[PDB]
Amino acid sequence: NYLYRLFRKSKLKPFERDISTEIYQAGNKPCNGVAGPNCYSPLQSYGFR
Amino acid sequence: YAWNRKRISNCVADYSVIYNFAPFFAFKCYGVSPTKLNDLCFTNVYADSF
């Protein structure tokens, strides 16, 4: 249930919340909004056990 | 069982060639983000192939 933002273009400001579930471009190739190698979802869940 | 290990030292790490080599079923990175790798400098890189 608990997720963290692995990827963002820039660092956040103090006391700012980012909830945008947009894809991030991690590679030179444009993702165009579809998951692909060099393209990753920013939000990943913690494996709490 | 006899997995190959190559030590990597004293060279520039161009990860972009790794990125574009093939379509990858998994590119999971544990403990480091994939984007920061180019801007990070490490003492040793071990490549294990199997």
Q: Following DSSP, what letter does each residue of A2-29 receive, concatenated?
A: -EEE---SSPPPTT--------EE-SSS
CB atoms near residue A39 (< 10 Å): 19
CA–CA dist B49, B44 (Å, integer): 16
Resolution to 1 decimal, in Å?
Answer: 2.9
Kindly provide the b/e burial profile for residues B6-19, where b requires at least 16 CB atoms within 10 angstroms of the residue's own CB: eeeeeeeeeeeeeb
**Partner residue facing B33 (CB), from A6, A27, A37:** A6
Taking any CB pair shorter than 8 Å as contact, residues of chain B touching chain A are 16, 19-20, 23-24, 27, 33-35
Closest by CA position to A28, among listed B7, B19, B42, B43:
B19
| Alpha-helix runs per DSSP H in chain B | 15-20
* A1: Cα separation from own chain's centroid: 16
Residues A37, B27: C-beta atoms closer than 8 Å: yes
Q: A26 and B23 in contact by Cβ < 8 A?
A: no
Residues 6+ apart with CB under 8 A from A40: A6, A7, A24, A26, B27, B34
